[PDB]
Coordinates of C-alpha atoms and ligand atoms in Angstrom, one line a residue:
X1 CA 86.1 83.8 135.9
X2 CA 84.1 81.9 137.9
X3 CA 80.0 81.9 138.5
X4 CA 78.8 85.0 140.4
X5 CA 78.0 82.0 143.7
X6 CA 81.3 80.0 143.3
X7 CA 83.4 83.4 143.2
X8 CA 81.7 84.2 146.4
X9 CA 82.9 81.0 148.2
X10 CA 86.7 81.8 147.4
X11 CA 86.5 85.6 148.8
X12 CA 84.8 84.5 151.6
X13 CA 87.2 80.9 152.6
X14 CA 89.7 82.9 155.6
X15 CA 87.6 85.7 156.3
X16 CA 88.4 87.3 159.6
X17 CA 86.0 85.5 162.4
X18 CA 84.5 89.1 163.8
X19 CA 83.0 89.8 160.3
X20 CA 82.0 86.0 159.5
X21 CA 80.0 85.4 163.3
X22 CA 78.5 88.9 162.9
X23 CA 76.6 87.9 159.4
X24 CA 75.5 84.9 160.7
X25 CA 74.0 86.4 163.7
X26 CA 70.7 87.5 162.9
X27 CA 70.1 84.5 160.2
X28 CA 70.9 82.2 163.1
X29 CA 68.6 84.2 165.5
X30 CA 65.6 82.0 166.9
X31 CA 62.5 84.2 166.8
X32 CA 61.6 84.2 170.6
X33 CA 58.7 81.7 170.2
X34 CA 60.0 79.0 168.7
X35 CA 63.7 80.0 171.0
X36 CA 61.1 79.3 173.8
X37 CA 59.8 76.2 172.4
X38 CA 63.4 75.1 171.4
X39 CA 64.3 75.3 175.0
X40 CA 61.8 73.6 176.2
X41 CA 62.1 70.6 173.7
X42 CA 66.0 70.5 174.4
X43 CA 65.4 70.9 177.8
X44 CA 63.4 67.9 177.8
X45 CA 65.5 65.6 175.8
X46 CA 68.3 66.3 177.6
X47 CA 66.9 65.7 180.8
X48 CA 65.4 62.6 179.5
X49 CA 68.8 61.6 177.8
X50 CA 70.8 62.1 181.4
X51 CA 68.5 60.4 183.7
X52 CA 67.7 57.3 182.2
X53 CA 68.8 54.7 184.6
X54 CA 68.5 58.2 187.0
X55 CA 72.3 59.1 186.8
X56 CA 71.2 62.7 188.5
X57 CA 69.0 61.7 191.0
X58 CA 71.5 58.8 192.1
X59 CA 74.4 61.4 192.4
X60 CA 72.2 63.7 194.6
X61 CA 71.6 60.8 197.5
X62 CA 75.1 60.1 196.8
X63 CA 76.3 63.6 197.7
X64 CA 73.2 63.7 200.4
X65 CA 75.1 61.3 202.7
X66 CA 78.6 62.5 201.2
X67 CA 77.8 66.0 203.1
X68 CA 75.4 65.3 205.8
X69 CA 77.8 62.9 207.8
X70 CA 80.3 65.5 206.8
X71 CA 82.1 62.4 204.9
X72 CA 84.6 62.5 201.9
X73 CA 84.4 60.1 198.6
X74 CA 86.7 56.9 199.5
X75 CA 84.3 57.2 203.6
X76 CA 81.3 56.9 201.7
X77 CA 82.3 53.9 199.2
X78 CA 83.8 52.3 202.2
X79 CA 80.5 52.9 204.2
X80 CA 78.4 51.4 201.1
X81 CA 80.4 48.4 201.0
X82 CA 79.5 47.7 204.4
X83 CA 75.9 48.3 203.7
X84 CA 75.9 46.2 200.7
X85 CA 77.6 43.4 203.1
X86 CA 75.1 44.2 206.1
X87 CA 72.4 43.6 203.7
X88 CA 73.7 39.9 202.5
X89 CA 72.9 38.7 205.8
X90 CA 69.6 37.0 205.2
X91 CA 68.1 37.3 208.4
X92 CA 67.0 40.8 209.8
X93 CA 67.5 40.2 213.2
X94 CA 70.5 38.4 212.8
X95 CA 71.4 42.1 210.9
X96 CA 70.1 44.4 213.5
X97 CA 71.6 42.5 216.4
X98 CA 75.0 42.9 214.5
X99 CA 75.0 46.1 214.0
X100 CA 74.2 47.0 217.5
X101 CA 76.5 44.7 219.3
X102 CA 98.3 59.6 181.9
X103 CA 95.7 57.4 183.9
X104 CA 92.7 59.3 184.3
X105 CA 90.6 56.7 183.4
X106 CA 92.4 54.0 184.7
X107 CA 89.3 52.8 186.5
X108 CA 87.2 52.4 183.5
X109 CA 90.1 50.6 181.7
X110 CA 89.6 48.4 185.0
X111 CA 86.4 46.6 184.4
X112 CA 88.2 45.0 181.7
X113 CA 90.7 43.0 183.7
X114 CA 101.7 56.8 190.5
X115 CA 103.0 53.0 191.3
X116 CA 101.1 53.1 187.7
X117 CA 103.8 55.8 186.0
X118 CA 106.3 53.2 187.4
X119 CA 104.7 50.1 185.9
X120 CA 104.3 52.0 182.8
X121 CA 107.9 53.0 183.1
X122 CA 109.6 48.9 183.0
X123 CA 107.7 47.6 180.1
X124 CA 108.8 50.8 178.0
X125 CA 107.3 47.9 170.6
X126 CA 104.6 47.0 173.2
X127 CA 103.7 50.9 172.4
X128 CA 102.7 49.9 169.1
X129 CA 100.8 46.9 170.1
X130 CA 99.1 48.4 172.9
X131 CA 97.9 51.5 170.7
X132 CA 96.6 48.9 168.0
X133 CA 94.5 47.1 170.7
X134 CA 93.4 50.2 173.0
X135 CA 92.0 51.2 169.1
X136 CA 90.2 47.9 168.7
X137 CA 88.7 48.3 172.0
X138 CA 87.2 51.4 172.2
X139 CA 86.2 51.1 168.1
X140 CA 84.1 48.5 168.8
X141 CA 81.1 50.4 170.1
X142 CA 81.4 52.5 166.6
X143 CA 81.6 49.8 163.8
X144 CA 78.1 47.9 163.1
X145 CA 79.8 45.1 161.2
X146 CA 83.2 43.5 159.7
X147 CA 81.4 42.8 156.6
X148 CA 78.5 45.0 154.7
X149 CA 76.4 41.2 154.5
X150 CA 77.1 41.2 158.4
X151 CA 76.0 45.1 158.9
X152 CA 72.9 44.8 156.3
X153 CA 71.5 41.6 158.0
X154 CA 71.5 44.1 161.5
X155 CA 69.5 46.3 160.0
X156 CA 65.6 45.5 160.4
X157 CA 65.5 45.9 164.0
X158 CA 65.6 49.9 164.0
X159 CA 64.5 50.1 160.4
X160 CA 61.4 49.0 161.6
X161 CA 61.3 51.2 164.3
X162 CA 61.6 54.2 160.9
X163 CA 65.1 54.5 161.4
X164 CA 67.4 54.4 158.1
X165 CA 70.9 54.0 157.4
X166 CA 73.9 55.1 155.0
X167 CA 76.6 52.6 155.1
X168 CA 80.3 53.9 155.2
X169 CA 83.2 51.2 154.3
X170 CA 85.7 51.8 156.4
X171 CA 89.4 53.5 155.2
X172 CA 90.1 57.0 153.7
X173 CA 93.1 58.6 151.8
X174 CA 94.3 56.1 149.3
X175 CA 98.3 56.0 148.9
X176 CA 98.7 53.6 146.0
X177 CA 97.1 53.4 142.6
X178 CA 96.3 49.8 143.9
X179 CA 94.8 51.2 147.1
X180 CA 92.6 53.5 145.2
X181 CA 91.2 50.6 142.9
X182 CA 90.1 48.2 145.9
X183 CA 88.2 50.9 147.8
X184 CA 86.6 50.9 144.4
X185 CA 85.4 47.3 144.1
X186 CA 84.8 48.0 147.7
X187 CA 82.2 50.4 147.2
X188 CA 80.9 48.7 144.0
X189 CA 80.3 45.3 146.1
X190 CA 78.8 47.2 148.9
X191 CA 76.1 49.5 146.4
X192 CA 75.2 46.0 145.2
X193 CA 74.5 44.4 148.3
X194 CA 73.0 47.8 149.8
X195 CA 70.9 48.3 146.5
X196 CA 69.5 44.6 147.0
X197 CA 68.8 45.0 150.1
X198 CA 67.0 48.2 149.6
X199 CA 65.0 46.3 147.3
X200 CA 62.9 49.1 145.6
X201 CA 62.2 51.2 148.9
X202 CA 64.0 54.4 147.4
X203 CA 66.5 57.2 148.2
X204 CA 64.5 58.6 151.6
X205 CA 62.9 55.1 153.7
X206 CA 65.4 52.8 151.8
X207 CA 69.5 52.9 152.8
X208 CA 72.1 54.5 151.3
X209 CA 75.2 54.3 151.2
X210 CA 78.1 57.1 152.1
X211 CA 81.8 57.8 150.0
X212 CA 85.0 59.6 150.7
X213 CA 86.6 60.7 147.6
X214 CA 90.1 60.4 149.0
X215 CA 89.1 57.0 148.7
X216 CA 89.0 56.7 145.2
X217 CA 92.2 59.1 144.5
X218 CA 95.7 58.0 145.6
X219 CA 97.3 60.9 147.3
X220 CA 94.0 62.8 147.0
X221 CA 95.3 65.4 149.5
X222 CA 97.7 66.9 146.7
X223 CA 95.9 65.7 143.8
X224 CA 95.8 68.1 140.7
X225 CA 92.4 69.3 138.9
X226 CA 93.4 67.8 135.4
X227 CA 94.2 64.0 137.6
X228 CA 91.1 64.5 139.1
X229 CA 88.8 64.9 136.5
X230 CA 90.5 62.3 134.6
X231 CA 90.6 59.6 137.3
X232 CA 88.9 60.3 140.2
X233 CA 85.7 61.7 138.3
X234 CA 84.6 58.3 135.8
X235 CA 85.2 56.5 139.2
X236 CA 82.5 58.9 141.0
X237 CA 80.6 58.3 137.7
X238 CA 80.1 54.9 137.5
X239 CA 79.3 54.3 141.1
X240 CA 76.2 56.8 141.5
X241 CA 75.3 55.1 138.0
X242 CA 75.1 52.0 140.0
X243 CA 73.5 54.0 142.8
X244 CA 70.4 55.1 140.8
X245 CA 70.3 51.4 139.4
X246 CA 69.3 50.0 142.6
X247 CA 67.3 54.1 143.6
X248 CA 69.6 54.3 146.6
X249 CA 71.1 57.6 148.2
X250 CA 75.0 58.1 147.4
X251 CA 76.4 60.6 149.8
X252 CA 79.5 62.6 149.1
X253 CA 81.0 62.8 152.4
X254 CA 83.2 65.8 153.0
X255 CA 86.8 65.7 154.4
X256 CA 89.9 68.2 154.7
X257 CA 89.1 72.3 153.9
X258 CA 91.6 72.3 151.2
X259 CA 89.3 69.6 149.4
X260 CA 86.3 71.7 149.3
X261 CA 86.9 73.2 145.8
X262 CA 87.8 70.4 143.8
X263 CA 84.6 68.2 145.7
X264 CA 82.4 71.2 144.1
X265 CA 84.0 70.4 140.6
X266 CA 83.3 67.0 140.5
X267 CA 79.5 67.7 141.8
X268 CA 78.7 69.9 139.2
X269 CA 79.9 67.8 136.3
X270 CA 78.0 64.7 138.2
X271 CA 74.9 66.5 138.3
X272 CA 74.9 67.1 134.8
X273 CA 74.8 63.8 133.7
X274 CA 72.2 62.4 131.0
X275 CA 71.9 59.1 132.8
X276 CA 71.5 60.9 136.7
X277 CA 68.7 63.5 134.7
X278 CA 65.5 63.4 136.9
X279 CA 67.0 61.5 139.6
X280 CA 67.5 62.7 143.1
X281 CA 69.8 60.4 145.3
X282 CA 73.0 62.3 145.0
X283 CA 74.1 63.3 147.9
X284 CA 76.6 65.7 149.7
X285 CA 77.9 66.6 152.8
X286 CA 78.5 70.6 154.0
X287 CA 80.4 71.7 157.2
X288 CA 79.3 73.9 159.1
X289 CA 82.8 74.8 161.1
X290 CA 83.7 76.4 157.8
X291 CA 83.3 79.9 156.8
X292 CA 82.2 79.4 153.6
X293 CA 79.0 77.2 154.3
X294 CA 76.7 79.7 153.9
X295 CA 78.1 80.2 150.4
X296 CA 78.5 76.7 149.5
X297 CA 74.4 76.6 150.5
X298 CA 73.7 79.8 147.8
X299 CA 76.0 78.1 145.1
X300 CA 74.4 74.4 145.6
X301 CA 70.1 75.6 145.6
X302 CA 71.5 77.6 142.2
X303 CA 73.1 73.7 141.0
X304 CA 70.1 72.4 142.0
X305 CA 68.1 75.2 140.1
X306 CA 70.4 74.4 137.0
X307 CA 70.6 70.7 137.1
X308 CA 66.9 70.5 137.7
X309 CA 67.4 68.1 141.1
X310 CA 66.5 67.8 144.9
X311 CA 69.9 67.7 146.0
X312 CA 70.1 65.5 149.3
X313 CA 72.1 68.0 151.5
X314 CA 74.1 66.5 154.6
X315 CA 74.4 69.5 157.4
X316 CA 77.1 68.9 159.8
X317 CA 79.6 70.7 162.1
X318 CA 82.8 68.8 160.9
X319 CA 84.8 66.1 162.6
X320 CA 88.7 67.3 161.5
X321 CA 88.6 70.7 163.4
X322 CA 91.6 69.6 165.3
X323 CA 93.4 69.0 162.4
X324 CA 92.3 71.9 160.6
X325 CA 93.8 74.5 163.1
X326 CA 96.8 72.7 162.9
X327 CA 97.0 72.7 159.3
X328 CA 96.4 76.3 159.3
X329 CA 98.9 77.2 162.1
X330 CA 101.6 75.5 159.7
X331 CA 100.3 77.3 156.4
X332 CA 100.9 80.7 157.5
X333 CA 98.0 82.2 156.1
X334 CA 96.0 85.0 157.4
X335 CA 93.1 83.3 158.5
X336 CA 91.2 80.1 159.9
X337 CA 89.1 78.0 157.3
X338 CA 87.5 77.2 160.0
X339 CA 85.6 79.0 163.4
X340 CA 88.2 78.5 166.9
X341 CA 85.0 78.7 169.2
X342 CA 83.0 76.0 169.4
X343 CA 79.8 78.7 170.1
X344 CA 80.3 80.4 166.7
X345 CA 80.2 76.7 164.4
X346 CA 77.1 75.9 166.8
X347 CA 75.4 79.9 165.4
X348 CA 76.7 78.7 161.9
X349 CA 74.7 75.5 161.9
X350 CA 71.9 77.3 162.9
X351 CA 72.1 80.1 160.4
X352 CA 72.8 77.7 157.8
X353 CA 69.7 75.2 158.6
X354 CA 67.7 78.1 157.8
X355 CA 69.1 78.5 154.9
X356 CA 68.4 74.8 153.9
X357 CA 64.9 74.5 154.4
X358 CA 63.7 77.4 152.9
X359 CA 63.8 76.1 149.5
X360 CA 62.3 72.4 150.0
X361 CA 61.9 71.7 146.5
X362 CA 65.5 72.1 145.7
X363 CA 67.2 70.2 148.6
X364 CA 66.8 67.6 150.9
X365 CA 68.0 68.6 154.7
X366 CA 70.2 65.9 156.5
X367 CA 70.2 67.3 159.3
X368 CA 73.6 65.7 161.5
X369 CA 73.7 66.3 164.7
X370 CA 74.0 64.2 168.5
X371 CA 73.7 68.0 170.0
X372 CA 69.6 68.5 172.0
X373 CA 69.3 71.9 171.4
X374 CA 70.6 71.6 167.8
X375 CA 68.1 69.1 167.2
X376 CA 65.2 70.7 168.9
X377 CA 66.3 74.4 167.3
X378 CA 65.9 72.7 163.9
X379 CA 62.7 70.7 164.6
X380 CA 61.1 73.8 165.5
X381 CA 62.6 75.8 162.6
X382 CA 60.8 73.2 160.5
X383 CA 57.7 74.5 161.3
X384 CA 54.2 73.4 161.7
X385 CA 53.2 70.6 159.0
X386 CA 55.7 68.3 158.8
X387 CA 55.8 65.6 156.1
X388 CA 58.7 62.9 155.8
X389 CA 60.0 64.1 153.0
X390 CA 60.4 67.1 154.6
X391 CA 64.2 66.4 156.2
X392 CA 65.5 63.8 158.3
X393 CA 67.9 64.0 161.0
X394 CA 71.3 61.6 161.6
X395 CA 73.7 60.3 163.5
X396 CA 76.1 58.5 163.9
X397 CA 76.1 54.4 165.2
X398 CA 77.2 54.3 168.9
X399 CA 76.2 58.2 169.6
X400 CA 73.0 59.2 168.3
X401 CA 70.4 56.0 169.1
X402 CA 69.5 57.6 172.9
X403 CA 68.6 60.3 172.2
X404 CA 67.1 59.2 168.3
X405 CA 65.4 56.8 170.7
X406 CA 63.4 59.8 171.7
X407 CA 63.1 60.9 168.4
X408 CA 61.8 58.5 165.6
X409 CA 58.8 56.3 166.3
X410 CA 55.0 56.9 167.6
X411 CA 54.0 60.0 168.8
X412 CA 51.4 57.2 171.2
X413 CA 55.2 56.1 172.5
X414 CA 56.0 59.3 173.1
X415 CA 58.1 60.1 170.3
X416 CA 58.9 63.0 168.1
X417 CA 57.8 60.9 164.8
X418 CA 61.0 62.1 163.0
X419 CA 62.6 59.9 161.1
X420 CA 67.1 59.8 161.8
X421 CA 69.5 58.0 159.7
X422 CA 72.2 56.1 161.5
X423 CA 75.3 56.3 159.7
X424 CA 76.9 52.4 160.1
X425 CA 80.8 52.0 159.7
X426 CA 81.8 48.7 158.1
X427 CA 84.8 47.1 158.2
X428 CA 87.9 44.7 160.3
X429 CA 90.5 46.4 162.9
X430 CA 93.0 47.3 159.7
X431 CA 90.4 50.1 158.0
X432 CA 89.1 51.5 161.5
X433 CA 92.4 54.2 162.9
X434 CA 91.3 57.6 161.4
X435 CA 87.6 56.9 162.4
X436 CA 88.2 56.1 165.5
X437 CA 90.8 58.9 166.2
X438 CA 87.8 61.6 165.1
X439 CA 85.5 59.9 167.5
X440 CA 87.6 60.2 170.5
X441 CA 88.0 63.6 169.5
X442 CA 84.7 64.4 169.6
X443 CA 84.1 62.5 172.8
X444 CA 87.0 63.5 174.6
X445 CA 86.1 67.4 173.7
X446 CA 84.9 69.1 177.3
X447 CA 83.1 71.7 174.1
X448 CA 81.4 69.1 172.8
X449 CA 77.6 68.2 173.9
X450 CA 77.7 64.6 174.4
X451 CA 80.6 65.4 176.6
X452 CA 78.9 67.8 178.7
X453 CA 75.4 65.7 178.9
X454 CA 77.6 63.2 181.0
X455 CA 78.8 65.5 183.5
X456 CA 76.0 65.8 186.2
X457 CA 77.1 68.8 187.7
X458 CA 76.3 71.2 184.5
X459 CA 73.2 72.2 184.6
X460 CA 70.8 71.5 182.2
X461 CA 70.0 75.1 181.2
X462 CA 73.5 75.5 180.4
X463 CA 74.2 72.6 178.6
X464 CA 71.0 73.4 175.9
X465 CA 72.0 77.0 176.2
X466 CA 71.1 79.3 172.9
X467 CA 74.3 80.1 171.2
X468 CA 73.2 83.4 169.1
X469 CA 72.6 84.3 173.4
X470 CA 75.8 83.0 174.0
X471 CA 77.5 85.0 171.4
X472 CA 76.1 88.2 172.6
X473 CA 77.3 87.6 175.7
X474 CA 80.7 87.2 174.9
X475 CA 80.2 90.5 172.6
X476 CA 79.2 92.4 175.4
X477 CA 82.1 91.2 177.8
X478 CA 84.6 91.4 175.3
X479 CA 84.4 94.2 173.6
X480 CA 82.9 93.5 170.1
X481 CA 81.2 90.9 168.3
X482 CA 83.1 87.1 167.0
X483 CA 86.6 87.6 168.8
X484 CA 88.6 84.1 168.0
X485 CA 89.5 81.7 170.7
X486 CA 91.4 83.6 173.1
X487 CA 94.1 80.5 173.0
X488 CA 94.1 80.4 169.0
X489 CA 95.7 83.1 168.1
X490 CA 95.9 83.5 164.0
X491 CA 98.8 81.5 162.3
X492 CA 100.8 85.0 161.5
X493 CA 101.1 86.0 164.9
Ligands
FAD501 C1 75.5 61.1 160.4 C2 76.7 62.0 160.5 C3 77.5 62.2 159.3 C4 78.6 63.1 159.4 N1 79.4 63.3 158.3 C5 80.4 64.2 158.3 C6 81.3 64.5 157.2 O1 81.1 63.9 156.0 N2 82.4 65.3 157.3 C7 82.7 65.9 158.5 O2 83.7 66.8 158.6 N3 81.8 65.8 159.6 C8 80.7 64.9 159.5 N4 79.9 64.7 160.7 C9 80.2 65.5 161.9 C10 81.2 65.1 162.9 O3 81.5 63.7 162.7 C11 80.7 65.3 164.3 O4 79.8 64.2 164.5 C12 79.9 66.6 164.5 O5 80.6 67.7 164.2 C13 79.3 66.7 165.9 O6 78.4 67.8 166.0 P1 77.2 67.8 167.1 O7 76.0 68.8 166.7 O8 76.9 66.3 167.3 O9 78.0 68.1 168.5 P2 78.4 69.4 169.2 O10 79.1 69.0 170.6 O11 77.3 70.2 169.2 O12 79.3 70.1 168.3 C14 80.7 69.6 168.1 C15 81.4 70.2 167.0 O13 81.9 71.5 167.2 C16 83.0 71.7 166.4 N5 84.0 72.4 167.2 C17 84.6 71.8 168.4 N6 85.4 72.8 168.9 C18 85.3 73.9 168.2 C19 86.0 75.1 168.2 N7 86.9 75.4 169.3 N8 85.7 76.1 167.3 C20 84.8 75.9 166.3 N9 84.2 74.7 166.2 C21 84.4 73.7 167.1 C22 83.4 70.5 165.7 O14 82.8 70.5 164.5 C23 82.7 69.5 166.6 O15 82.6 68.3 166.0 C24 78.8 63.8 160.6 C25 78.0 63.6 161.7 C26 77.0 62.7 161.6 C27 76.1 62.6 162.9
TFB502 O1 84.6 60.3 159.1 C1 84.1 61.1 160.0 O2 84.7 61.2 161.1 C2 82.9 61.9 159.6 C3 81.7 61.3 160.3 C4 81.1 60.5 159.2 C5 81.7 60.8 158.0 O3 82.6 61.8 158.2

């Protein structure tokens, strides 16, 4: 039999997604104060985080001309090229005088060097070498160094702006006993190096460091409790032994829905240990695209309770949702793990924010998001009288630092004065696929904010919109209350 809070996370892991956004509503509910001052802030960021460089206001001249003259696109770059060329001539008069007598983005891919399908048709081996080197080049921009000496010695520049970091070695879901054991000296060499550079700072200004258990496992997706526990678990162990050594955050990231359970087993046997007693750097992700968030939240403040800890608690939406609905449309079963619009995860990570910083002396809010509104919902769900310790928000390297730019540092600057922790990939072209891949999912996603914040013909009241508001209007065109995606219908059916 399990504990009253771990029983309550298996009953509720496919429930049906009318029931599961209904709960969540009114815990995800904004009072309408702080709703009012949530807009306003996301509002604010947002329109800062657009119109830098004054992206908006550029494409309204643009469009200006583009409808006055009553011209098309292709008329008005052709007319600016012959303003730009009018305006080389270095002599006004001289100017006057003149004047009065598959492959969507195929342009961006441009920069860099129809009758395309054609050209792509001849050349189809170069498949496998173009994929490796389209993956290179567009994983650059998310990877802060090939080595964790190279990514450490990058660090100072934003740390001293109050930014911190958790370091993630690149490569995931060990095959071979042999794999397995390297991502393990991997991780050992890097808590060294991380721990040193930390020097003394501790688990909340200093870095940290971030693990994927499929890491340390071969064939961790099919792995068996009694392997686990044997294997896997010592591993675990011995490197947040090492961890608490050097007083540096080790953060349990989280990866597929079917790993949940087993990634609670190992926690609560870690937790207990004599050596980790009185120390509070462990770490562990929850995703908020899952149903049973909410209950993984009761059964970790009653570990933390238990184990006598501040558990550091990593909120995030998830980054394998594609792969999840995929999973589950080959299982059969009769449910999602996971919520099929992106609205209802959004109500979830509100509702479940709440949750997390109710009970400040038992967990430590890491609060993961790139999303404006998320981030100004849960600044103002804070409350008045913040103190650092209080939570910190985090992002990820080559998405979060615009808008974090707006974020941490002096209030006299303009800033929020909150501190974020940039999560730093480490690692050469050969340990960089499966990363990458989640980030172009995420980027590519027309649901997804940072995906939206580009587009300068969404309004801005749209894009920060309040999801619980969203929600109920759905409810009230629909019919009732958490329908799924209308395109994901359940696996059974
Ligand atoms: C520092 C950091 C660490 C992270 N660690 C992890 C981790 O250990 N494990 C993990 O799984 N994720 C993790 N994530 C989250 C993941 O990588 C994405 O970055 C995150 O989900 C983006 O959310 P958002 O608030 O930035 O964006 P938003 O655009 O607000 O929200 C996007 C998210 O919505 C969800 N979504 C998209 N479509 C749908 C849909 N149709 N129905 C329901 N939900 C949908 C997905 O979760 C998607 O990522 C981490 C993120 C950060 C910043
Ligand atoms: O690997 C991923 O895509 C997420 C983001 C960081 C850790 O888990």
């Amino acid at each position: 039999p399990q504990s009253v809070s771990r029983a309550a996370i298996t009953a509720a892991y496919r429930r049906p997604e009318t029931e599961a956004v209904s709960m969540l509503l009114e815990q995800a509910r904004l009072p309408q104060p702080v709703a009012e001052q949530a807009h306003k802030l996301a509002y604010q960021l947002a329109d800062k985080l657009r119109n830098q460089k004054n992206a908006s206001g550029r494409a309204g001249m643009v469009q200006g001309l583009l409808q006055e003259f009553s011209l098309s696109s292709q008329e008005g770059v052709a007319l600016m090229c012959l303003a730009e060329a009018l305006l080389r001539i270095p002599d006004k008069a001289t100017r006057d005088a003149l004047i009065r007598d598959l492959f969507v983005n195929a342009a961006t891919w441009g920069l860099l060097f129809a009758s395309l399908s054609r050209s792509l048709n001849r050349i189809i081996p170069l498949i496998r070498k173009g994929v490796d080197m389209a993956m290179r080049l567009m994983g650059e921009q998310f990877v802060t160094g090939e080595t964790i000496a190279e990514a450490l010695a990058n660090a100072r520049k934003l740390e001293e702006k109050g930014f911190r970091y958790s370091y993630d070695m690149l490569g995931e879901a060990a095959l071979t006993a042999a794999d397995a054991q390297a991502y393990m000296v991997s991780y050992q060499q890097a808590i060294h190096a991380i721990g040193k550079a930390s020097n003394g700072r501790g688990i909340y200004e200093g870095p940290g460091i971030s693990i994927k258990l499929s890491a340390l496992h071969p064939r961790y997706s099919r792995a068996q409790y009694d392997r686990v526990m044997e294997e896997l678990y010592p591993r675990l162990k011995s490197l947040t032994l090492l961890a608490r050594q050097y007083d540096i955050g080790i953060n349990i990231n989280a990866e597929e829905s079917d790993r949940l359970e087993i990634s609670l087993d190992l926690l609560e046997k870690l937790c207990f240990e004599p050596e980790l007693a009185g120390w509070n750097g462990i770490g562990f992700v929850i995703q908020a695209y899952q149903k049973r968030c909410p209950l993984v939240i009761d059964y970790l403040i009653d570990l933390a309770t238990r184990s006598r800890r501040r558990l550091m608690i990593r909120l995030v939406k998830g980054a394998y949702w594609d792969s999840e609905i995929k999973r589950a449309q080959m299982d059969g079963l009769e449910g999602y793990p996971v919520y099929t619009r992106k609205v209802y995860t959004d109500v979830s990570y509100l509702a479940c924010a709440k949750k997390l910083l109710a009970v400040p002396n038992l967990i430590y809010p890491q609060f993961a998001t790139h999303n404006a509104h998320t981030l100004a919902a849960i600044y103002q769900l804070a409350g008045q009288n913040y103190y650092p310790g209080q939570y910190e928000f985090q992002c990820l390297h080559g998405m979060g630092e615009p808008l974090y730019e707006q974020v941490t540092g002096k209030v006299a600057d303009g800033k929020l004065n909150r501190p974020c922790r940039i999560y730093a990939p480490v690692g050469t072209h050969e340990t960089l696929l499966a990363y990458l891949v989640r980030r172009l999912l995420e980027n590519g996603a027309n649901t997804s904010f940072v995906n939206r914040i580009a587009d300068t013909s969404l309004p801005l009241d749209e894009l920060v919109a309040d999801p619980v508001t969203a929600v109920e209007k759905l409810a009230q065109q629909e019919g009732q209350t958490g329908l799924p995606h209308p395109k994901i219908p359940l696996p059974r059916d």
